[PDB]
């Protein structure tokens, strides 16, 4: 969790809080319309350069910013394939309820497992000095959950094995 992820976590925090200087901006190709500019990528003069934060080859933090919208996709550790399946299913459930989260994408960008997307409106109404707090909190708690759920798998396997075998 922490006491363990200081430099990576603080680098992500600083980069995210620096990249969240959004602004209301309409569409330069369609009139009377405004769209998240990071997702469309049609006007390159307002798209800041993509930025990547990493701690190890299996952990990355792609930070793509724009004038109004910021997309922030991360990779979390999957040491063994058990954690691979657990991470995939858990993060699918996480993104399946993006309606009540307001900063999630229903489908992550390829080569990743989750992609946040903070449009202007979220910074407009929701005070954003704890969106990053939620970000880092999730980035550590997710590994916590994966470990706990694999423990629960082992426990249930033990219980069912005992229940089956005792009734000879």
């Amino acid at each position: 969790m922490s006491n363990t992820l200081r430099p990576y976590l603080n680098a992500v925090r600083s980069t995210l809080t620096a990249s969240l200087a959004l602004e209301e901006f309409s569409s330069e190709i369609v009139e009377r319309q405004s769209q998240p500019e990071v997702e469309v990528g049609r006007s390159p003069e307002i798209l800041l350069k993509p930025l990547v934060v990493s701690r190890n080859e299996q952990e990355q933090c792609l930070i793509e910013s724009s004038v109004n919208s910021v997309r922030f996709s991360i990779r979390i550790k999957q040491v063994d394939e058990i954690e691979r399946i657990l991470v995939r299913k858990f993060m699918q459930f996480l993104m399946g309820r993006a309606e009540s989260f307001f900063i999630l994408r229903r489908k992550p960008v390829q080569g990743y497992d989750i992609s946040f997307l903070i449009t202007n409106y979220h910074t407009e109404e929701m005070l954003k000095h704890k969106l990053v707090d939620f970000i880092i909190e999730f980035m550590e708690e997710v590994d916590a959950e994966i470990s706990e759920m694999k423990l629960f798998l082992n426990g249930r396997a033990r219980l069912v094995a005992e229940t089956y075998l005792s009734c000879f």
Binding site: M1, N3, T4, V79, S147, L151, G155
Partner: protein, 372 residues
């Protein structure tokens, strides 16, 4: 690698930290407790299970179960929960980035060792791990190389004589009387004065009573005769309920169970006779040195005046021509940890790990043929 993990997963208490440090970063009771009521409240963050210090603090509405019984883990689910707690909630370091050192009592079933190694390698994916005996750790901590070690803890008491750099596995004596049995006997003999302790919370309270009041006398008959004129021996304790209880001859009676195991109805030698037999089982040429080096270790050996009485009994048993000396450092409560850290911070120890690449190519039986 900068530092290596090390965890003393003892039966009653668990000690964890980094190799080379001189202070336990994390010590919490090895307790996993589940609620036993309804919770008509709303919210409150209903947590399914509380482990460690949280369970010790909220024992009012919880039932506590020790995963390790008599040094053998019996609830692997609770053991995994405790290891997860140590890794994430208190030390909060990723297991996959730190080799770990574990401790297991001698003469335990091989199933315990194999299962522990497999769990650490697969469920936690540690880089490397090692399993060591308590007596070797005690010798490492004390700075000695020769001397029989008495390791009395919460779960089991064992003796492992070790000459200069060599251990005699055939002279290892293991006794299943320990702090938990002493606490149970104290609970049983506190009933004769009226006070009754039943639930696990009462068991922890009695453990605190034994912590703060129990001590070992010098001569049992003389101490009982003195207690007959019960004038200047009784003490008082304050329960959390606020009621004050008085303690008497049972203040020192229950520590004597170590020296007279017949008190709890078990036919075995005391912690002095077992040491004498363990020394006599060794070669004759090394007894003259093992007598001079008696090592006290573990939490149970923290009773006041236990060392003096044990020295008296061993001197009585042994011939008078050769002197008997017993040693007990004031920090012997964490002697096992100190030895473990000293061993883990040794350059010559770097090639004695068990790496994952070594483990997966030989199965979980590799621990038997490498660790010990």
């Amino acid at each position: 690698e900068t530092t290596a993990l090390v965890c003393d997963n003892g039966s009653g208490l668990v000690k964890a930290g980094f190799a080379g440090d001189d202070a336990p970063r994390a010590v919490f009771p090895s307790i996993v407790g589940r609620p036993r009521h309804q919770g008509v409240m709303v919210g409150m963050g209903q947590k399914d299970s509380y482990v460690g210090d949280e369970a010790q603090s909220k024992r009012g509405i919880l039932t506590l179960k020790y995963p390790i019984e008599h040094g053998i883990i019996t609830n692997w689910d609770d053991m995994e929960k405790i290891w997860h707690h140590t890794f994430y909630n208190e030390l909060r370091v990723a297991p996959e980035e730190h080799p770990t050192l574990l401790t297991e009592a001698p003469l335990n079933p091989k199933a315990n060792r194999e299962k522990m190694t497999q769990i650490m390698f697969e469920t936690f994916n540690v880089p490397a791990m090692y399993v060591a005996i308590q007596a070797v750790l005690s010798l490492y901590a004390s700075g000695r190389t020769t001397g029989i070690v008495l390791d009395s803890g919460d779960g089991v008491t064992h003796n492992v004589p070790i000459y200069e750099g060599y251990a005699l596995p055939h002279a290892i004596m293991r006794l299943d009387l320990a702090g938990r049995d002493l606490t149970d006997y104290l609970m049983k003999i506190l009933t004769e004065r009226g006070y009754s302790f039943v639930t696990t919370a009462e068991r922890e309270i009695v453990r605190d009573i034994k912590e703060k009041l129990c001590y070992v006398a010098l001569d049992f008959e003389n101490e009982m005769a003195t207690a007959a004129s019960s004038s200047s021996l009784e003490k008082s304790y304050e329960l959390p309920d606020g009621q004050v209880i008085t303690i008497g001859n049972e203040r020192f009676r229950c520590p004597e169970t170590l020296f007279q195991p017949s008190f709890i109805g078990m036919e075995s030698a005391g912690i002095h006779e077992t040491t004498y037999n363990s020394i006599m089982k060794c070669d004759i040429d090394i007894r003259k040195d093992l007598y001079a080096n008696n090592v006290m270790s573990g939490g149970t050996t923290m009773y006041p005046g236990i060392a003096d009485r044990m020295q008296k009994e061993i001197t009585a048993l042994a011939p008078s021509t050769m002197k008997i000396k017993i040693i007990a450092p004031p920090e012997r409560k964490y002697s096992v940890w100190i030895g473990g850290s000293i061993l883990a911070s040794l350059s010559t120890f770097q090639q004695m790990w068990i790496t994952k690449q070594e483990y997966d190519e030989a199965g979980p039986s590799i621990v038997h043929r490498k660790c010990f």
